[PDB]
Design a protein around this ligand. Structure first.
Ligand SMILES: C[C@]12C[C@]3(C)C[C@](N)(C1)C[C@](Br)(C2)C3
Ligand SMILES: C[C@]12C[C@]3(C)C[C@](N)(C1)C[C@](Br)(C2)C3
Ligand SMILES: C[C@]12C[C@]3(C)C[C@](N)(C1)C[C@](Br)(C2)C3
Ligand SMILES: C[C@]12C[C@]3(C)C[C@](N)(C1)C[C@](Br)(C2)C3
Ligand SMILES: C[C@]12C[C@]3(C)C[C@](N)(C1)C[C@](Br)(C2)C3
Ligand SMILES: C[C@]12C[C@]3(C)C[C@](N)(C1)C[C@](Br)(C2)C3
Lengths: 307, 307, 307, 307, 307
């Protein structure tokens, strides 16, 4: 039962793909285990680079495949290194870049909380043969958060476990349990850009929408309100070409609907003001004086929806 | 006639390409068959990973090529494992990610119902040489319907068959028969997002389309409807740049056609109302008060395209 | 002069790239020719898949390179199979996916008819050496044209010809003639979507444009047509996001020009009626009574461009 | 000093990447030189394709690396062929699809004409070791420019020179001059589509912009001009989605600005016209019929950027 | 401690990826060092290109792997050359295309200054085995900034330093030592297109925004003002569709915000003016005379917001 030490160096976590629920992660893996001693020039340890490694395995070297469970496709592997010690122990080293998968709820975008996840598990050897002794995760990052899209807030998670499969092969006595390394990183979205350039002008759209009411005439009140729709729709497209594609509504997505409603409500009100009467033009001078009523009556719908 | 057991592990199904009638699938194939009994180190089964598999094949290990029939181009194959047993049987283990094809009808979008399909068939060995014994597909799926894009309803459907090829080699008697595994997953689209954010606002527009009829003046009636047609056009672009690429109209696309018609029909009435006569300035007192005549007339006809 | 029979299996034709004049084709090549008698294992044929084919060539099996003339870059080659017969003949089988080139006129879009073409020609052996005996191409044809972007209508033509190069290397006597396979597939674009979501609404825009003439005031007539000019710009971009990139005008693109033109023509008429004059007020009430005139002529000028 | 004859067969030039300044080229390289007399099967020439070439080199065949100086990344290598003659001479043949770099001016878009360039230069051998004897470039060209994106009008140019590198290896004797083949192909952009679907309508817009002055009222005159501001802005977005992203203004980019200016200048006139006064109402009695001044006044200025 | 020469020939820097903090670099690397004296063919140096290098390493040749630390994924490598001189020295030569990462602030867009960084560091050899002796960087770049995306200003800075990694595999004395080459290249963005086609028209809108107060009536003063909101929105989409996507505000977007803001305050005034009163209609004849009041108050903030 080989105790295998692992260490993951996270260099960059970037390129989150919103629809696929996918992100890319650059780094190095370091795997070590103690086999039993080998002969070698002097009393040195050896360095074995890239192409010369399989030359070593062809002569019967056991170098186990350690698989990234949650990666999408095969990872781009840079330089690889075998360090063979005289006492027996063996360092495997490789740089990697791969696209990883994980469940990502974006409903409350751009205020979403997500976590970048790594899961490592040997491909061919169960826990009785190859199991992970201990694991360090080195995230060489700090400061300059206000420039990055994602703010790592935690440091790094680490969890060695045993996973068993009950539906198998049909070798069963104990080829059921593989030891699995899982790395988690909590990160928060930098909401700044969407706040000041998307949320903020939207509010100004909706507010100024309501000021259709301090128009004097009815025709003005109604006609103008159409120009306002033309406006929200226009604001929809500007939002939509640009915001990341999803299969469910975000916060902003709703705000737009809220825009549409605010108004459709205003259209009905404007017609009602005019046509609830005892003559014809009995404008409910207080319902037309929903001048400061309904802008706040819109806040009732907004903060109830916070609950 | 070699009996080969197969097992498919579906890991992620994502990236539906609507035009290419294409979807991406991450998973594993497992193939096992009984060979001639061998001598392994000790007496334990012997494990052979990646690079040395080719070495084993080159010295004569029969590993049949199993081709995915409906894959587009050759797929990203991860790790390969040969597990060689002393009793004879051989266990093939390999991870894959591929683009797969199937006829996919999207006309009833976003209410479309689909089935994701896999087809596996040996490349060079017919049914009299290589035969598919049995097939289980392990689809590690459940829950979160609500939140992500596709709702699986099936579990894993299956049909092992013999395929007859009419036009061949220079082979004669019965070697036109290949055994093929076909794996099916029935699935439904989560229409929530398109319902609330696309269908709903369109309705408010078409609702507002009709609100031109509560305008008082004639000049007011026609100028207004032009801004209103401009508005539906504005909505089309917002819609189209976002919606999936297709070669036919969706349900949504029709709603848009219905929008234009609504307005264009409204234009005809308004002009018709004004210049048909019996003095000169004959406002048809009833026809203009069709204010909620055909808006329900859209609700009647809309609920007519039903079937 | 080795006689080589070939067969092409057309699996999918997709992804027409209009500017590159490029489309994708998935399939198989089957090359068969008769070699010198070999003594095989047992007496039935020996099959060589993928990896092992390369080692057979190194020890001197002649497997001629067959290149796709009209492919863009090298094709994604799938499984490879060498089937070696005892009477001598050898059958090569390989799966491929590649992007192909051909002259593709898209002017009559969305009614363009194309032909997807495969041209096969030996790389190193001219017809004195390697000759194409015959070729059938099996298209996986039938039904569901209405769900597909392209409607294949011919069942492909085929003609083996000999192609001669006047301009060569330092080879002399008659090594300037190569035998070439040409596969043509007649295909038409599915016009449904482009008709109903693009042509139809556009027609109504141009029509409703003309109803500017039923306005009573001059001021209205002119400030109005600016909204309409605003609409054709609007309709263009909506078409523009979507329609395939070209270096020439399409049919739709023409319709848009006439739209711009129709209103700019209206602007001139509207002003002409109004300010050339005997008066100030002398809109020739019959020249402005081109409300139903100018629509007849748009079909006259419209149906000539069919010329 | 090995004399090497080279010939390039140009198959297709496509995919101009405007921001990267790169275009892709399909074709073949043909290089020939004389080696030392060899023994061939019989006495006929020997053909060596792809896989077997690698092995000829291990046993000591001198195959010089000819590098594309101006390629971006390494090119897609198709089939390779060695034709080995008994007297010694050698013919190298390869298909390529490559990403090429060259300086490209787009300021005068869409009327730009460019020259596509290839530069070939040995990777390891100076001119005294390897010298380029001559180069023919065969561009299989003719006809239907009207369907293609680019109109090649030249017939391919040729330039062999010696290139000197001042700074070093540090093998010094003369190290420093490599023989370089430079190939140029002159081409013009097909302006047809950009003329009729962009230039023409922009003009009608700017033209109709001037139609604001034949309005009788001031409010009509000023309010309307806002719509034209919206129209030019609308036309801006419509243009920008389609046009090539660049780091400088094109002819069209300016033509748009000319629109903005024509309208913005009109605004100042219209404002100036009404309120700088001797009464309240002092529209300068002849300045409001600046309806025919400013349009030709835009044309004099338009004909000014001659320069 | 092996003394190693390095030389970097940069022929292209392109493809700045704004969200990923990424840019591409094409060039060649040259590394040389002195080994133990060798027996070469004849006595002049032997050149080893591509394929034959693997053969040389198998005979026990030490060729060190030099890694680009700040690359994302592995570089696209072209031709490789070994220059083996008889006295011991060895010179490595290779083409590369790589995607590199560096901290990149884009807030001051389009007036940003950046620096492109290359970091070279041995993969397996610490400072007392392999040391970087010296480094020249050849920037074969010059002139014609007129036309390219970036303006190089420096001549690249260079700094070899010793990078020590804090913790280990357990050896303490001095094996935590790596020599690192850092190459810096200063560059500035060409603001020309973004100034003239984005900043300038934006300003005229904002200018013309203020143009609502020379309107006579209140209803028109207010009705028009909604059109300006729509126009600023319209300009947002046009800008955002084309501008590079980022996670923070640029200069231009701020201008857009100020655009929305300038309009919203004017909206407040137009209402403020009319209905604080002693009748209903006594328009503060002084506050719609704020016609050049706060355009300068906006320009004062424009002058001040630069500090
Ligand atoms: C038993 C396992 C199950 C798994 C899903 C993952 C693995 N690491 C262990 C490899 C396989 Br082939 C076999 C498939
Ligand atoms: C006979 C077959 C036909 C096929 C289309 C599919 C296959 N599995 C069996 C392989 C090929 Br090469 C030969 C092509
Ligand atoms: C003589 C030929 C000409 C060709 C265009 C096509 C081919 N099959 C025969 C190969 C090449 Br290298 C030589 C180029
Ligand atoms: C609503 C919009 C607004 C815009 C400025 C940009 C667009 N993408 C959406 C197209 C137009 Br025509 C309509 C003009
Ligand atoms: C001496 C040269 C200089 C060059 C820029 C181009 C080349 N063909 C000759 C290869 C290199 Br590595 C060496 C770099
Ligand atoms: C010890 C090192 C540390 C490093 C960050 C960089 C390197 N060149 C030396 C490779 C690794 Br894997 C190990 C990671």
């Amino acid at each position: 039962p080989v105790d295998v030490s692992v260490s993951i160096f996270i260099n960059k976590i970037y390129g989150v793909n919103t629809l696929e629920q996918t992100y890319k992660v650059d780094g190095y893996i370091v795997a070590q285990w103690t086999g039993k001693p080998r002969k070698t020039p002097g009393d040195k340890p050896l360095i074995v680079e890239n192409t010369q490694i399989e030359r070593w395995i062809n002569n019967g070297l056991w170098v186990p495949a350690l698989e990234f469970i949650n990666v999408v496709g095969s990872p781009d592997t840079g330089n690889k290194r075998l360090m063979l010690f005289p006492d027996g122990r063996v360092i495997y080293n490789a740089r990697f870049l791969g696209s990883f998968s994980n469940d990502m709820d974006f409903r409350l975008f751009p205020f979403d909380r997500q976590q970048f996840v790594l899961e490592l598990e040997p491909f061919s050897y169960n826990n009785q043969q190859l199991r992970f002794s201990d694991i360090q995760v080195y995230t060489e990052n700090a400061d300059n958060e206000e420039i990055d899209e994602w703010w790592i807030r935690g440091k790094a998670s680490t969890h060695i476990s045993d996973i068993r499969y009950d539906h198998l092969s049909s070798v069963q006595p104990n080829q059921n349990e593989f030891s699995r390394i899982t790395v988690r990183i909590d990160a928060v979205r930098n909401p700044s850009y969407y706040l000041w350039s998307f949320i903020l002008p939207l509010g100004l759209i909706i507010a100024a929408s309501w000021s259709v009411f301090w128009l004097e005439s009815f025709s003005e009140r109604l006609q103008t309100s159409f120009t306002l729709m033309l406006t929200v729709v226009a604001y929809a497209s500007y939002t939509s070409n640009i915001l990341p594609r999803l299969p469910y509504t975000t916060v902003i997505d709703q705000m737009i609907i809220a825009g549409y409603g605010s108004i459709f409500a205003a259209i009905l009100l404007i017609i009602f003001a005019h046509h609830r009467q005892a003559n014809g033009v009995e404008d409910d001078l207080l319902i037309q004086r929903c001048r400061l009523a309904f802008p706040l009556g819109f806040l009732a719908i907004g903060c109830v929806l916070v609950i």
